Amino acid sequence: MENFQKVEKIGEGTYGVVYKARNKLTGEVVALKKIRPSTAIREISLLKELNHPNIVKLLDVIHTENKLYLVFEFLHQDLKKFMDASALTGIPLPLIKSYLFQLLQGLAFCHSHRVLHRDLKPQNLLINTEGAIKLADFGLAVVTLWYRAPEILLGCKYYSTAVDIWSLGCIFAEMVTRRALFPGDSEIDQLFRIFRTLGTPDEVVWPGVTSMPDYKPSFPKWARQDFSKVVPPLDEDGRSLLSQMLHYDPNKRISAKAALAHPFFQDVTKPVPHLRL
Numbered sequence: 001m002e003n004f005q006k007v008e009k010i011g012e013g014t015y016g017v018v019y020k021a022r023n024k025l026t027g028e029v030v031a032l033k034k035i036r037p038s039t040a041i042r043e044i045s046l047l048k049e050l051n052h053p054n055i056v057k058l059l060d061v062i063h064t065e066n067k068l069y070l071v072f073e074f075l076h077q078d079l080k081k082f083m084d085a086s087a088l089t090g091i092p093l094p095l096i097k098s099y100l101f102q103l104l105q106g107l108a109f110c111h112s113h114r115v116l117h118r119d120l121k122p123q124n125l126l127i128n129t130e131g132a133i134k135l136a137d138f139g140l141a142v143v144t145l146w147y148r149a150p151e152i153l154l155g156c157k158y159y160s161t162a163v164d165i166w167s168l169g170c171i172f173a174e175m176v177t178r179r180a181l182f183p184g185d186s187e188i189d190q191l192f193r194i195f196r197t198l199g200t201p202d203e204v205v206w207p208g209v210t211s212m213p214d215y216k217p218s219f220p221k222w223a224r225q226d227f228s229k230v231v232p233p234l235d236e237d238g239r240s241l242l243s244q245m246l247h248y249d250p251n252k253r254i255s256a257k258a259a260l261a262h263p264f265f266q267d268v269t270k271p272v273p274h275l276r277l
């Protein structure tokens with residue numbers, strides 16, 4: 001826009017490009033998403049009133065010249081970069097726990113307001129120097145499939161808040177192990193990597209699963225792998241919480257509110273991360 005001076009391109013989505021920009025008038029530094037539907041913009045305009053310390057603030061929405069611009073408060077680094085920067089040593093557990101706890105608070109908040117994110121991934125989890133982490137780039141009603149809930153992969157038409165809990169569980173596992181939990185390269189490979197680790201779901205653990213749009217009786221039948229092998233460095237409270245975030249049945253999957261009460265968070269604190277900007 002004319003009112004903004006692009007500083008640098010900082011990312012892209014399957015619908016828009018995000019720039020670090022400076023308000024030529026106020027000088028405020030922001031994240032500006034450019035997108036090339038009044039019902040959607042109404043859904044967007046609503047996100048503006050979503051104020052929570054763990055949700056990136058949407059400052060303005062401008063529809064002009066066949067372009068939709070979303071102006072957000074700017075954070076200095078995303079979790080993917082932080083994880084890559086911390087790959088040799090690993091993010092300390094207290095910080096992992098703090099981040100998970102904060103993201104659950106953000107989700108408990110949007111979910112109580114009937115807002116789903118739908119596409120959580122390290123690249124849209126933003127951190128600052130003060131130890132906070134916030135949910136960014138909410139999704140509206142080469143793409144990464146690594147954090148996709150099984151019900152989405154199986155063709156469910158209606159998503160529930162449980163899809164965000166699944167994504168956050170995959171991210172939690174990744175911070176702990178320093179390796180993506182389910183790194184699929186195709187929808188079926190994604191689905192099958194999930195099955196190989198958690199076991200091929202059936203009617204016992206997931207009532208209705210065999211009646212899902214994309215379920216095939218011909219899916220291979222893999223046995224559930226021992227959880228202690230999945231995220232070895234994680235203590236039992238962490239593994240217990242993770243298993244509840246990764247339940248196959250959306251209705252059995254733990255809620256963000258309930259997860260916040262899990263014993264894993266008994267000793268949660270808010271450490272300062274070492275950020276190289």
Ligand SMILES: COc1ccc(C(=O)c2sc(Nc3ccc(S(N)(=O)=O)cc3)nc2N)cc1
Pocket residue numbers: 010011012013018031033056072073074075076077078079081082123124126136137
């Ligand atoms: C995938 O699509 C997205 C669309 C929009 C947003 C968004 O709201 C952002 S991105 C941002 N700053 C930032 C992001 C990454 C880095 S990095 N890579 O660590 O050097 C540094 C700064 N601040 C806000 N508020 C995030 C993702």
